[model samples]
Target: MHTNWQVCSLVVQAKSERISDISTQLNAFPGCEVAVSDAPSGQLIVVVEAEDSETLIQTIESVRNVEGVLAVSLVYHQQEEQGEETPRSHHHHHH
Candidate 1:
């Protein structure tokens, strides 16, 4: 049987309109991944996978503290199996 768990996802819009800066900052955190970023629209979609709720909260808090990030919102949460691989493709472009 697979153990299902919750992970937090966040969509952010930066007031300074700097996607690169936001992306750089977010990538600094462990388990935080960038799904997409739109520089012109000043939008960033980030996915963070943590073992528990507290870690998720802490990670988000760290992201929120980054300069130029205007607003951060919790978009969704989903249950995924433990030890299961995250949606990462080695051949895929990250930036």
Candidate 2:
């Protein structure tokens, strides 16, 4: 079976006072593995992994609908063969 995997990074902004709550809610969504909040700025760095682009996009849309979330922006996105390790760096920096 050929397994396809998609990974993406997102910058999620929420109301400053409700950053933590938004992070918690974002983590509850399927494929959302990382949700680190910078409470002071109401921003979160979220990483999600999914089986396909449709699922990934749906998850992102759901995150946008979470209470207290102000916006969701794509920081990074890529798709790779499940078992093939490409010699590429996935590191991304926030502006």
| Candidate 2 residue spans exceeding 4 A from truth | 77-95
Clashing pairs in 1: none
Assess the local accuracy of residue 18 in candidate 2 as a C-alpha lDDT between 0 and 100: 89
Instruction: Name the weakest run of 10 consecutive residues (lDDT summed) in model 1.
Output: 1-10
**Top-lDDT structure, candidate number:** 2
Please report, in order, the local distance difference test score of every candidate based on alpha carbons: 0.78, 0.81
Task: Report the C-alpha lDDT of model 1 over 1-95, residue by residue, as the tens digit.
Answer: 33354566788888546788779889778878988887887888888887767777788889889887888887864456566466755686687
State every prediction's TM-score relative to the real structure.
0.70, 0.73
C-alpha positional error of residue 15 in candidate 2 after TM-score superposition, expressed in Å: 0.8
Error of 2 at 50 (Å): 0.6
Could you report the Cα RMSD, in angstroms, for every candidate shown?
Answer: 13.8, 12.0
Cα lDDT over the full model 1: 0.78
